[PDB]
Design a protein around this ligand. Structure first.
Ligand SMILES: NC(=O)c1ccc[n+]([C@@H]2O[C@H](COP(=O)(O)O)[C@@H](O)[C@H]2O)c1
Ligand code: NA
Ligand code: NA
Length: 303
């Protein structure tokens, strides 16, 4: 339905308030039975794209759980269908859906891979469309954060690091940023560390974080103007104490950006719940000047 699709997009677009408005509208879609209807219509050829178009915008934390419990196979399939359509409007929708389905759990990451979702993302990594590539880089970051060790062998077998490096060197800041985040998360796997160190992608972090204001970057893309979920950030906390100094810097930069976003929402309480305060205080007093200043700024913004 075009009217609901426009309501939710307009809601997400509201600076500051959009997080709470979109959250509520997406919960309403589930409670009214609309989400179940979308999932049933996403296998009907005439209704697939319109259904997928709306699904891509409503895969919040609680709706991701609903999809996993009631019809993951159907939603993964419509996403794959969209990546094989000649229209770039479709490819963006399909990769966007897959991007969000990688933000639920280790087991769900395994099922999405099993059903071909990762194959579709990697296929689209060879496109030139910026929006699609942004979805791809974000999807691989999410998979790196949520996949767990059980999915790290599969990424190695499929040479996911190889696919990430060209995205890390992309000139677009959003493609580069989330490709680097995925790399910074994957270097915790020593098998992947050697390939990362060989690539030199981690050398891109220091120029980026020192040349980008966290707040301004938070406004660079409507798709992430409200930051990430608490469960996404919970999984990023371990990178604040990563082996690689470059990874700690990027994680510290991100939490500084998120602190500013959550401050303007009034949601700084999430950092205490995910046990990020003590991790940030640890960084705020460490000798790493770059990560230390970002972590200190974050704590001030949390208040
Ligand atoms: N997090 C944001 O800044 C933002 C902005 C616009 C839409 N959305 C929608 O939210 C869902 C993803 O939820 P999270 O961003 O909370 O992980 C997707 O359906 C996406 O289209 C998120
Ligand atoms: Na949000
Ligand atoms: Na943004």
């Amino acid at each position: 339905l075009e009217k609901i699709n426009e309501v939710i997009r307009r809601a997400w677009a509201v600076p500051t308030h959009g997080h709470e408005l979109g959250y509520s509208l997406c919960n309403s879609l589930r409670q009214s039975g609309g989400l179940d209807l979308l999932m049933k219509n996403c296998v009907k050829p005439d209704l697939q794209f319109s259904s997928a178009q709306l699904l891509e915008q409503c895969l919040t934390t609680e709706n991701r759980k609903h999809v996993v419990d009631n019809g993951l196979d159907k939603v993964v399939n419509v996403a794959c269908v969209c990546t094989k359509n000649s229209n770039m409007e479709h490819s963006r929708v399909g990769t966007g859906i897959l991007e969000h389905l990688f933000k639920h759990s280790e087991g769900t990451c395994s099922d999405v891979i099993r059903l071909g979702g990762l194959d579709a993302v990697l296929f689209e990594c060879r496109t030139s469309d910026l929006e699609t590539l942004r979805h791809c880089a974000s999807a691989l970051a999410n998979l790196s954060l949520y996949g767990g060790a059980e999915n790290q062998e599969e990424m190695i077998l499929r040479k996911v690091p190889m696919w990430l490096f060209p995205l890390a060197f992309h000139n677009d800041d959003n493609i580069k940023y989330y490709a680097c985040l995925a790399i910074a998360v994957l270097v915790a796997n020593k098998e992947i560390e050697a390939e990362v160190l060989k690539s030199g992608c981690l050398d891109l972090v220091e120029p980026f974080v020192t040349s980008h204001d966290p707040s301004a970057f938070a406004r660079s893309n409507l798709a992430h103007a409200h930051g990430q979920s608490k469960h996404w950030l919970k999984r990023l906390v371990p990178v604040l104490s990563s082996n690689r100094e470059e990874a700690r810097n990027l994680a510290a930069f991100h939490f500084c950006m998120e602190a500013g976003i959550k401050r303007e929402q009034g949601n700084t309480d999430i950092f205490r719940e995910i046990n990020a305060i003590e991790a940030l205080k640890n960084v705020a007093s460490c000798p790493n000047a770059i990560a230390s200043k970002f972590a200190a700024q974050a704590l001030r913004l949390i208040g």
